[PDB]
Amino acid sequence: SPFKPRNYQLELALPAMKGKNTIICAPTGCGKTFVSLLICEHHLKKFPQGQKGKVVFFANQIPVYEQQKSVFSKYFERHGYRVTGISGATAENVPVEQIVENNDIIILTPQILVNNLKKGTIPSLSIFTLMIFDECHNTSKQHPYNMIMFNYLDQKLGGGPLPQVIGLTASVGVGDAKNTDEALDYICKLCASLDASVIATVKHNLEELEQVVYKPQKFFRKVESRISDKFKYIIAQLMRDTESLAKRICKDLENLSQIQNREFGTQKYEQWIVTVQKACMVFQMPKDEESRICKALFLYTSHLRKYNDALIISEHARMKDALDYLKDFFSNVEIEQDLTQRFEEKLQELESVSRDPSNENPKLEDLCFILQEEYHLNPETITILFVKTRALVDALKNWIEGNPKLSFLKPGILTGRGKTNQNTGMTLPAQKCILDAFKGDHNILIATSVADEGIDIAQCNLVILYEYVGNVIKMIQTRGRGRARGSKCFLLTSNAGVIEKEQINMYKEKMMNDSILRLQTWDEAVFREKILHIQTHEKFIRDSQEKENKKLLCRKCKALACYTADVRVIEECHYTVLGDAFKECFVSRPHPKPKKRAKIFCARQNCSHDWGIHVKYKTFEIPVIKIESFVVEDIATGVQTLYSKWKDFHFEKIPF
Amino acid sequence: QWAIHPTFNLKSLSCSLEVSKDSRTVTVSHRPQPYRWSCERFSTSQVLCSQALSKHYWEVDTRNSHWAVGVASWEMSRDQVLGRTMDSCCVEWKGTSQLSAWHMVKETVLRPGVVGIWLNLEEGKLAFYSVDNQEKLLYECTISASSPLYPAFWLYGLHPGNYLIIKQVKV
RNA sequence: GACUGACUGACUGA
RNA sequence: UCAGUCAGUCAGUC
Ligand SMILES: Nc1ncnc2c1ncn2[C@@H]1O[C@H](COP(=O)(O)OP(=O)(O)O)[C@@H](O)[C@H]1O
Ligand code: ALF
Ligand SMILES: [Mg+2]
Ligand SMILES: [Zn+2]
């Protein structure tokens, strides 16, 4: 209530208060959410007595969903309209068919709406009478926003009432454009995707929009790599030794993969090693002698790849982290003892070099320098730090916690709901706790990608990007986090290519903000004509564009695990096998490593590879497996191919 | 009469900061400048003079952002910020366009100008004077450290192109 | 709290 | 056109 709408906010609603499907574009930090509120309030009051209208609000990321839901709840609490939400976190949700009808304003995460549409609980999209998309820029390709819009367009073009469509965005994006013409191509295609008709941008009140909204400045920091690194030398020499051992046993190793001029620290080397794994695994002989060859190649390749990952982790984190990674792998995990000795032979040297402070990673040193100067300048500041991956989040957290130099900082984390690769992220109450804490004692946030597209942590004076890059949409959303005035962004990187990419991205942004000024001069009906043309053409394209007993062997020791004709899917997702023979083909660990249920492991003492885990279903617990760990060989022919997920492989599925 | 001309040393120069050949001009480099790695280096965009002082006055001009000028002695730790550890007495221009003084790790708040340092441990007196068109009087206090004292400076290091230099006015 | 499955987008490389 | 990493989202069993 106490908010007094600013001029440009009133200006940005008229095209949508009139009832035309619209796209609303304004710089980051404008009052888009408030504008959506005004549009919804004015649309709600229009219906005559006896007829009521539902509003839907999508939002694709959970923290954003909670923030938007709270804003809507507080604003429309007074009037008495009833708001609600359906998401993935809700447990044993009461029927969605009923919850939609009971409540007027529904906030969803779009994949829910697609679920219900395909299932048939919501019959037809005609129920809703307003749709609001909080990232108009995502509606393309096969993103769930676009699948909702596909259903809508299919309903309109062929042959009831159909709902109004709004979208809010701060940057519509240029796709693959090279000149202004290609940008216009892409922007018109976007507008066509969601039944657009008007693009609304601030023009009259630009003078005011400049005073209230502050554009943060940008800066680039290029960091010298080390003159000489001891860690890299030692590990690379170990890798070369292992590579020579790999060379010996197989007649040819280079031919298996076309990739060439491999370097030790790159991702290219990772691709080489994986392709070599997947090529050696399919070598066949006319039949027990080659088992030793396969096992050996498995081991050499595996340890080589793990050293590679160590080098990369070392590049992006403190050296101690890489040493910890390697030590943990060797603790957990014949030839194995040979290479265990080969690592322990040098381990003390690595421990020595790790703790010598003069070899501290230069990037992290620059991060310390920048944080220290900035926080000394203004003692009250809040920083966001964007990192590519989840492991780097924990590494940087450790680094901040126990560095004497950066005492002021008091970190917090923020990642996404899902749990992947032995790290598990925050749950919804945890995210709410962190964000409300910022509203407090915390003074720096460590985020993955999920904290883009509007987290709205006011009073941010510093965004730091730790080798973070992408298409211009990402650049605009990331640079816009610093809502507070006086804010800065620092792109901090070691590779010159990234520094170049950010400059070309700034140029692309300028081109986009020109090609959207151009499109506002067309007549009011040429737009509608060409949009209908694009919609129809794309509908035609999309509509017509769609219309035994193989033995399973071990990926590492090539022993007859089971047969396809003896696997019965259970509840259509978990997979299981039956028979006393299979119960002899593995030996469950008496005290499994996680303990937290028992895992599976290969029967032989020679081979111990992760076949699966054990889970309990109703009365009887059953053994489940993962296809990543087997190799399929035909019952008659000798063919062999590798399937990463169950979905590619096709067998005579029969229910439990 | 008691005026001296302190000269910046390469001993404590910070990687980011840079110095001129005349050795009376200090600025912030556009790019990092490599230097030997030692615990002597500040690791913060600061600098320490070399004219050890155990009746000395010296004038630094602050024309051409944020600056701290002060006196600190060799005991001070490199990683700690100038003016906020015990041994160091400094005058700083905050980021909120106010002029503050840090003495004996105590905050004391108080329009900018070109400033001097006048110290005499003979009576344990430390004085600052902001002299532009008039002999304006700045914060003055009492402080005595056993070790001989050195002039010191801190120049905001994220913003390239701000330089601090030393003026040797004459009688 | 940890378990198994599918979906999508972005970035590389050949 | 095929590959390899990454990050978000949904479903089911405990
Ligand atoms: N009328 C107003 N007066 C003052 N502040 C406002 C007003 N409307 C919105 N804001 C502030 O602007 C902030 C950012 O708006 P938001 O919708 O998050 O921008 P974005 O377009 O990035 O989503 C909101 O947190 C709100 O507090
Ligand atoms: F909708 Al935004 F930053 F673009 F919250
Ligand atoms: Mg927003
Ligand atoms: Zn095996």
Domain of residue B28, CATH code? 2.60.120.920
**In which order are the strands placed within the sheet that holds A383-386?**
A217-222, A488-493, A462-466, A383-386, A444-447, A411-414
In chain B, residues 39-68 whose CB comes closer than 8 Å to chain A: 43-45, 66
Q: Does A22 belong to an annotated binding site?
A: no
Residue bearing tokens 């965004």: A463
The H or E element containing residue B155 is strand B149-155
Is B9 part of any domain? no
Resolution (angstroms) stands at 3.9
Last residue of a domain, one of A312, A341, A360: A360
Point out which residues pair with A40 in neighbouring strands: none
CB contact under 8 A, B79 and A376: no
**How many Å does it take to go from CA A539 to C1' D1?**
24
Rg, chain A, Cα only: 29
Q: Is residue B4 part of a domain?
A: no
Token pair recorded at residue A97: 């068919």
Residues of A in contact with B43 (CB under 8 A): 369, 405
Long-range contacts of B99-103 (CB under 8 A, 24+ apart): B99/B138, B101/B128, B101/B138, B101/B139, B101/B141, B102/B70, B103/B141, B103/B143
Q: Cβ-count burial of B115 within 10 angstroms (0-12 exposed, 13-18 middle, 19+ buried)?
A: buried
The CA distance from A33 to A30, in Å, is 8
Q: Is the CB of A177 under 7 A from strand C?
A: no
> What would the two tokens of residue B128 be?
């600052």
Are B31 and A222 inside 8 Å of each other by CB?
yes
A263 & A335 share domain: yes
Under a CB-based contact definition with an 8 Å cutoff, are residues A416 and A425 in contact? Answer: yes
Instruction: Measure A275 CA to D1 C1' (Å).
Output: 18
Tokens of A449: 């990608």
Measured between CB atoms, which of B32, B43, B45 is closest to A224?
Answer: B32
CA separation for the pair A172, A564 (Å, rounded): 49
Q: Are residues A326 and A472 in the same domain?
A: no
Q: CA-to-CA distance for A201 and A199, rounded, in angstroms?
A: 7
Q: Verify that A463 and A564 share a domain, yes or no.
A: no
Please name every residue paired with B137 in a beta bridge, in sequence order, or none if there are none. Answer: B129
Contact B158 A222 (CB under 8 A): no
Is A368 marked as binding a ligand?
no
Whether residues A516 and A528 share a domain: the answer is no
In angstroms, rounded to a whole number, what is the distance separating the alpha carbons of residues A39 and A9? 10
Pairing of strands B56-61, B67-73: unpaired
Task: Spell out which residues of A between 66 and 95 contact strand C, using CB within 7 Å.
Answer: none
Do the domain assignments include residue B7? no
Task: Say whether A557 counts as a known binding-site residue.
Answer: yes
Considering only CB atoms, B66 lies closest to which of A222, A369, A377, namely A377
| Residue A106 and residue A73 in one domain | yes
Q: Is B38 on the interface with A (CB under 8 A)?
A: no
Contact A651, A550 (CB under 8 A): yes
CB atoms B44 and A372 under 8 Å = yes
* Residue B121 domain boundaries: 17-167
Is the CB of A615 within 7 Å of strand D? yes
Q: Are residues A37 and A169 in the same domain?
A: yes
The technique is cryo-EM
Q: Which domain holds residue A118?
A: 1-214+523-547
Structural domains counted in chain B: 1
